[PDB]
């Protein structure tokens, strides 16, 4: 629809072309880390608390 | 159709002119004045970045 | 461009007639009196030899009194004044749904013109005593004082009154608003093609509307007409019959309609200016003596046919303007011995925060118990007998202590059913909702629960309710009552978020 | 035909003035309270 009413050359194609190709930055687990807050929460409850129990 | 000559006037009033097409026939610098204006106009509404490409934004994580 | 401009040229009507004709003898103030014109039938369209037309309102003996429709600049003593011989008629259908028509079903929206087929005039009779059947839809509204305490039947005049600035064109686009969700749905026994006439307002105001409207969507099923304060006095007194024709059509066409006029008391001001400049007698504050008749065969078309004539309908919500709750001003009391109803807004309520600021004392529909569903007939009644008692002894407020548990508790429940009414703006609820919270309200879950938190509650627990018990609110919806299971399954939601909060 | 909040002032018949007597009384009161209250403050600050 855009290449029929927009008249321009190819600047409509050329943007269709150049989205077509853009790709997003998907972004990347960072704050992924404090895993072993569980782990080690675990050991609080676990085996720190268990066998004290 | 041809019966009435006004038809025909304004008919060939127009094909004379879609032949002077070639250029906006008598525009007047008064024409180009409003086209800037307007043109501004609606550039300040759509913003100032640069209308050919794809402005880049790097996104920004947490 | 050119190529597209012969076919425009080409595209008209060259044709000349043998028409009727008489020459304006005089002008002046927008009322031209044409001299001839023999055979013009009273209150039609004559067109100007400029351009402009007019409403050949006043046929005296000698002379034929023309109100134009615009300014009379155009005009002067001796232009030629051609008959139409059609009375005024304006465009209809499902074209305009979503355009911006003037008073005359003129596209003044750009975007195209109007794809109309057929016509319809604009002085027809309201339907009869056997058509009409009674009122049995509810119109939600989705205002929960409006929805609950005031209700609204589809078919039924609801005055929306009340002074300068109180929020009545906002009680008005919450209607228009809450419309989008049976007008999505499938069902066509619910869907309301509602009308919005502006009458009186600046184009900056209808401007604003029809942004409100786009923005949510609105606008696919609503025309918007418009006689806005510049359009000459023709085009305002005019504009509500545009509507009202509109609006004729769907309803007849087995569809359901919804008509706001806003206001009707700048279309009595337009009218007793043509009435006065005609020179017709005048009356009490100076309006002529069809001020009633005006309004009355304006506000009668609006009913709801029966089955057997299609089953249409076609509300109407005549806005009002009081001056300072002068309610008793002329005006004020013809409007208000038309319709079937009231909802009064205030401005002491709408500054103490309770807004929509609506006065449930003075506001009444006529219909009442009827056009409510099951579900919210269970609940309002209880809320509504409750309101009532605690405003029959909230003068003792400021007070309070002092006095009997009894009186206590009454107003301990008030105030928290007053904090439940509250509402935002152009945030109206389905009707499940609204059962849900009035619920929460009215059987004792929150009477512990301090006055100023209330309107954290009921966001938070539609927020709770939507987003975890849908099934629940569809099984109200589909039948709309609350069976045993619903009002227990009800009763441990209420008890155990109440509980988680 | 009703009545309106805030009206006995508009009036300014008798309870109009009378209320705007009462009110004054209590805060230029309030206000000499205050401003005693403040200086004892601001002083004992010196040390
Ligand atoms: N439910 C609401 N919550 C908060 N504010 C509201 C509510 N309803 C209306 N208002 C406020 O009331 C003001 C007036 O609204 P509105 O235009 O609907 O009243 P109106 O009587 O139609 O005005 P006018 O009579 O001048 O046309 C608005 O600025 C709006 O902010
Ligand atoms: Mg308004």
Redo the contacts between chains.
């Keep these: 629809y855009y290449k029929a009413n927009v008249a321009k050359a190819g600047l409509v194609d050329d943007?269709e072309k150049?989205?077509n190709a853009?790709k997003?930055?998907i972004?990347?687990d960072?704050?992924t880390a404090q895993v072993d807050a569980e782990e080690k929460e675990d050991v609080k409850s676990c085996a720190e608390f268990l066998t004290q129990s | 159709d041809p019966v009435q000559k006004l038809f025909v006037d304004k008919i060939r009033e127009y094909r004379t002119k879609r032949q002077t097409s070639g250029g906006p026939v008598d525009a007047g610098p008064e024409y180009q004045q409003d086209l800037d204006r307007e043109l501004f106009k609606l550039k300040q509404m759509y913003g100032k970045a640069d209308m050919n490409t794809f402005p880049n934004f790097t996104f920004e994580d947490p | 461009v050119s190529s597209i401009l012969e076919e425009r040229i080409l595209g008209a009507d060259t044709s000349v007639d043998l028409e009727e004709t008489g020459r304006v003898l005089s002008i002046g103030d927008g009322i031209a009196r044409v001299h001839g014109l023999r055979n013009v039938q009273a209150e039609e369209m004559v067109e100007f030899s400029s351009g402009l037309k007019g409403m050949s309102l006043n046929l005296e003996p000698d002379n034929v009194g023309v109100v134009v429709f615009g300014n009379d600049k155009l005009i002067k003593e001796g232009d030629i004044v051609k008959r139409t011989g059609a009375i005024v008629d304006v465009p209809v259908g499902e074209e305009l749904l979503g355009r911006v028509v003037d008073a005359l079903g003129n596209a003044i929206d750009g975007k195209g013109p109007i794809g109309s087929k057929a016509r319809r005039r604009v002085g027809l009779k309201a339907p009869g005593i056997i058509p009409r059947i009674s009122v049995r839809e509810p119109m939600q509204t989705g205002i929960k004082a409006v929805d609950s305490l005031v209700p609204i039947g589809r078919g039924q005049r609801e005055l929306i009154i009340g002074d300068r600035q109180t929020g009545k064109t906002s009680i008005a686009i919450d209607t228009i608003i809450n419309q989008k969700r049976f007008n999505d749905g499938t069902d066509e026994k619910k869907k309301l093609y509602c009308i919005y006439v502006a009458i009186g307002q600046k184009r900056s105001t209808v401007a604003q509307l029809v942004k409100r409207l786009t923005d949510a969507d609105a606008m696919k099923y609503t025309i918007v007409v418009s006689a806005t304060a510049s359009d000459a006095a023709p085009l305002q007194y005019l504009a509500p019959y545009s509507g009202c024709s509109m609006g004729e059509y769907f309803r007849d066409n087995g569809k359901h309609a919804l008509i706001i006029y806003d206001d009707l008391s700048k279309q009595a001001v337009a009218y007793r200016q043509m009435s006065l400049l005609l020179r017709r007698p005048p009356g009490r504050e100076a309006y002529p003596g069809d001020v009633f008749y005006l309004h009355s065969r304006l506000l009668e078309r609006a009913a709801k046919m029966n089955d057997a004539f299609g089953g249409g309908s076609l509300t109407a919500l005549p806005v009002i303007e009081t001056q300072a709750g002068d309610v008793s001003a002329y005006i004020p009391t013809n409007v208000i011995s038309i319709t079937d109803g009231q909802i009064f807004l205030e401005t002491e309520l709408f500054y103490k925060g309770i807004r929509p600021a609506i006065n449930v004392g003075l506001s009444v529909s006529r219909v009442g118990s009827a056009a409510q569903t099951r579900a919210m007939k269970q609940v309002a009644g209880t809320m509504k007998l409750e309101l009532a008692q605690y405003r029959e002894v909230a003068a003792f407020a400021q007070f309070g202590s002092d006095l009997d548990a009894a009186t206590q508790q009454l107003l301990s429940r008030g105030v928290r059913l007053t904090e439940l009414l509250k509402q935002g703006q152009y945030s109206p609820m389905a009707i499940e909702e609204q059962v849900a919270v009035i619920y929460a309200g009215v059987r004792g879950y929150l009477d512990k629960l301090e006055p100023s938190k209330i309107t954290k509650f009921e966001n938070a627990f539609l927020s709770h309710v939507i987003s975890q018990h849908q099934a629940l609110l569809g099984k109200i919806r589909t039948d709309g009552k609350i069976s045993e299971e619903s009002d227990a399954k009800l009763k441990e939601i209420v008890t155990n978020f109440l509980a988680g909060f | 035909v009703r009545s309106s909040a805030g009206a006995v002032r508009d009036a300014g018949g008798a309870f109009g003035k009378r209320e705007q007597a009462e009110e004054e009384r209590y805060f230029r009161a309030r206000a000499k309270e205050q401003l005693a209250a403040l200086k004892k403050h601001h002083e004992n600050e010196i040390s």
Excluded: A, G
Aim: aromatic letters at 30%.
């Design positions: 943007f150049k989205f853009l997003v930055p972004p990347e960072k704050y």
